[PDB]
Design a protein around this ligand. Structure first.
Ligand code: MG
Lengths: 441, 429
């Protein structure tokens, strides 16, 4: 009735996915094998797990998500891991020789190799599904298939269904921290082929995960376990409406042309809170106002792009748990109140409340403390264009020096893809350039 | 499966790989006999991509023996783990190259290549999705290079998709173990700049310096040295051999290491390196090993990062840590000595981690960065070649092989061209 499905790519990406399905399975508490601890009573009023966990004729409830990546080592760990009763073989599609972070390889070269298997799996699930709203696709501009092969993936999947929503979680090159140097190539080559195949998607950067887990989670020494846990929470709440009763169970498609008013600049930030320790869970109270005012801390901004340097457009503060329409509401007045913040005035307010009544659940072994209320500030501003500009200037020079270009030209891409894709970020620079212009008079 | 093979010639290199497979055996804990005696399937999980099970569980290498005289074949044939081998691969010579490289390249070069490339090819059919293969010789003579030149040409043509990561011994500037070195070397390097996919420099004097100063050892041999290098060359495939929260293969490496294909001569750093007392001076941190990583004294090659500039730099980490540290030291260092970091390569440092370090240690570091400091290396060797080629000193041993001198000019203005090429890339912004 209300389905979504997750797709996983790139090393960090399927790392995220593993964390996620660990999470949801924890949260509905269905045991890793595929059974719930106990029988399910027959009831109505709304869906349940049925969105994602797959009903069998018995205690076998597998996700509705798919793995695809050409670097097949790690995924085997899932193939080995505790959830080897959880998942399902045909759920698993991997490539042996990954891209080597040639975008053009797993996009072009090995792009040709596994696509059809992917699409068949997709047809099996969507055919298995009925009211699948949209598509959860995860990848990374690092684990190279996460850029290339995913690029073809949406490039064709969109042309397959279209009417489904594109739920885009991919990681963005951290501003000064990194993984490689061809990242310019991965990213921008992705981007010009990303945009028109993307509906909307958010940009998760890691350095924020570090700084904030270390200060706010009080973390001393983190890694992808903590990161994947954190994105696990954020996606855990970004879709609760289709999973749990909330006052305004807003929906993705609902989010689509309302958060991203124009068609073009359709990405965003997301600073979840309240992430604190057990020793800050106590020694604190964690007000709605604390999560709320705290929600707009630029230093809390969960992607390393200063909001205060941008002007907000929309903010879908979907809330978990014991939320009051009034209290949050006045907090939103407080958000109108913030002098430092500046909004796409031709969209004076574009707010859209989310009050889901389940407060958050915590993953044992985790660092986040337990609370009563969650916020997701999926918000869109002018600010985020800048780091892009860093990307196209860095890539600008490096590409000017023809660095690495032999690698890509060797695999079947043309140079005008490069300069033209730079025209692509040129245009989007005109977009964040223009939409931020205040309409005259 | 991204499995790979090994091929070794070389007056030393034939010993080197002996130590190498020896080390890998330790990291797979399989008996010398060829059956596993370890404690995790993880050693067996990805075992194949170097090894090969046999009927009955004889576990075997994907190695290829090069030699022009069986002594080494007997030597390693006399080797512990020698029962872990396949008698098939003991492909050697009846003459020896005498290290006139033309001898080992035309004379005996053309003489015994065929049986090698055949059986090797049988190994090629034995490989499901061959990531590559590892060649080993030295870049100053012919005991390895004599034929290994022909190998790189032949297999390179025969497998234009496979990776050719080439380690061969570089003559140190000071000690000339032979005087025909500039000529063998230059003639080879002409080839290797064209045909080899990866190369990392193999000095002896660095290895001495490591053993004597930083190892604090007085008694140098080869075997320890090959321990020190097969440590690294053994580390390189770790992620490729074992899981890693941040993995990168040789394709991701080289493609993430080289701007232009002429730059696959790389320098190497591995650590930690202590004598026994040192641990009771110091302990292990990622920042610590980092503080060794950019050490010229671990810079195991004739090139100086202190004199040249890091065109590229990378870290190979095996262990269990927090990458939140790792990156942090990374960027920290990429600032701290920014000047030796080439400019327009943003984030010219790049990362990795293997969930397991090598055996015995808890954390692993490896550095195969690429400055351009090697220019003094080629400049030197080319210089000596220049002098005696003015003299034609020992041309008669040479032209007796029936080469031309114009080839010497070819590798000559060739190799100079490569040097100046590195000059402009170093001298640019
Ligand atoms: Mg991959």
């Amino acid at each position: 009735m209300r389905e979504v499905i997750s797709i996983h790519v790139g090393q960090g990406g399927i790392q995220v996915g593993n964390a996620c399905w660990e999470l949801f399975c924890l949260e509905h508490g269905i045991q890793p094998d595929g059974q719930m601890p106990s029988d399910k009573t027959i009831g109505g009023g709304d869906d349940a797990f049925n969105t994602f966990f797959s009903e069998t004729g018995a205690g076998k409830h597998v996700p509705r998500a798919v793995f695809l990546d050409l670097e097949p080592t790690v995924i085997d760990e899932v193939r080995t891991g505790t959830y080897r009763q959880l998942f399902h073989p045909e759920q698993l599609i991997s490539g042996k020789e990954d891209a080597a972070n040639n975008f053009a390889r797993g996009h072009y070269t090995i792009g040709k190799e596994i696509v059809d298997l992917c699409l068949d799996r997709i047809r099996k699930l969507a055919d298995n599904c009925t009211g699948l709203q949209g598509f959860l696709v995860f990848n990374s501009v690092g684990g190279g298939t996460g850029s290339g092969l995913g690029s073809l993936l949406l490039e064709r999947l969109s042309v397959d269904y279209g009417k489904k929503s594109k739920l885009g979680f991919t990681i963005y090159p951290s501003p000064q921290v990194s993984t490689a140097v061809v990242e310019p190539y991965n990213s921008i080559l992705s981007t010009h082929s990303l945009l028109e195949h993307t509906d909307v998607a958010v940009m998760l950067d890691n350095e924020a995960i570090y700084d904030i887990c270390r200060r706010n989670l009080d973390i001393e020494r983190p890694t992808y376990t903590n990161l994947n846990r954190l994105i696990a929470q954020v996606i855990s709440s970004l879709t609760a409406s289709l999973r749990f009763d909330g006052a305004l169970n807003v929906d993705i498609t609902e989010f689509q042309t309302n958060l991203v008013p124009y068609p073009r600049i359709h990405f965003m930030l997301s600073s979840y809170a309240p992430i604190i320790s057990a020793e800050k869970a106590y020694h604190e109270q964690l007000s709605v106002a604390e999560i709320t005012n705290s929600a707009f801390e630029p230093a809390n901004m969960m992607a390393k792009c200063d909001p205060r340097h941008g002007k907000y457009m929309a903010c879908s503060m979907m809330y978990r748990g014991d939320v009051v329409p009034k209290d949050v509401n006045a907090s939103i007045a407080t958000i109108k109140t913030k002098r430092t913040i500046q909004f796409v005035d031709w969209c004076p307010t574009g707010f859209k409340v989310g009050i889901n009544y389940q407060p958050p659940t915590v993953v044992p072994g985790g660092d986040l403390a337990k609370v009563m209320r969650a916020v997701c500030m999926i918000s869109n501003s002018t600010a985020i264009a800048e780091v892009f500009s860093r990307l196209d200037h860095k890539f600008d020079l490096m590409y000017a020096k023809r660095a690495f270009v032999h690698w890509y030209v060797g695999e079947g891409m043309e140079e005008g893809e490069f300069s033209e894709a730079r025209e692509d970020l040129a245009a989007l620079e005109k977009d964040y350039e223009e939409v931020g212009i205040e309409t005259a008079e | 499966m991204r499995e790979i093979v090994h091929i070794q010639g070389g007056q030393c290199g034939n010993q080197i790989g002996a130590k190498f497979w020896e080390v890998i055996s330790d990291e797979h804990g399989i008996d010398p006999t060829g059956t596993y005696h370890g404690d995790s399937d993880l050693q067996l999980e990805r075992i194949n991509v170097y090894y090969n099970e046999a009927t009955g569980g004889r576990y075997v290498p994907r190695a290829i023996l090069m030699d022009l005289e069986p002594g080494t074949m007997d030597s390693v044939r006399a080797g512990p783990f020698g029962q872990l081998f396949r008698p098939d691969n003991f492909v050697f010579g009846q003459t020896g190259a005498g290290n006139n490289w033309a001898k080992g390249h035309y004379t005996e070069g053309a003489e015994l290549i065929d049986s090698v490339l055949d059986v090797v090819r049988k190994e090629a059919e034995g490989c499901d999705c061959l990531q590559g293969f590892q060649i080993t010789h030295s870049l100053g003579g012919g005991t390895g290079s004599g034929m290994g030149t022909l190998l790189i040409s032949k297999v390179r043509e025969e497998y234009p998709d496979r990776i050719m990561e080439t380690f061969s011994v570089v003559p140190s500037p000071k000690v000339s173990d032979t005087v025909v070195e500039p000529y063998n070397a230059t003639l080879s390097v002409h080839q290797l700049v064209e045909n080899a996919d990866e190369c990392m420099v193999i000095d002896n004097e660095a290895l001495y310096d490591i053993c004597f100063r930083t190892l604090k050892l007085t008694t140098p041999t080869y075997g320890d040295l090959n321990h020190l290098v097969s440590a690294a060359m053994s580390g390189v495939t770790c992620c490729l051999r074992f899981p890693g929260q941040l993995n990168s293969d040789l394709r991701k490496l080289a493609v993430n290491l080289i701007p232009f294909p002429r730059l696959h001569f790389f320098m190497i750093g591995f650590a930690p390196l202590t004598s026994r007392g040192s641990q009771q001076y110091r302990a292990l941190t990622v920042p610590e090993l980092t503080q060794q990583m950019f050490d010229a004294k671990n810079m195991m090659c004739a090139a100086d990062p202190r004199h040249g500039r890091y065109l590229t730099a990378s870290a190979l980490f095996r262990g269990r840590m927090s990458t939140k540290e790792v990156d942090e030291q990374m960027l920290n260092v990429q600032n701290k000595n920014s000047s030796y970091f080439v400019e327009w390569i943003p984030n010219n440092i790049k990362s990795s981690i293997c969930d397991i370090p090598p055996k015995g240690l808890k954390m692993a570091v490896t550095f195969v960065g690429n400055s351009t400091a090697i220019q003094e290396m080629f400049k030197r060797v080319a210089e000596q070649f220049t002098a005696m080629f003015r003299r034609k000193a020992f041309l008669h041993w040479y032209t007796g092989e029936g080469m031309d001198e114009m080839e010497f000019t070819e590798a000559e203005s060739n190799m100079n061209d490569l040097v100046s090429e590195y000059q402009q890339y170093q001298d640019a912004t």
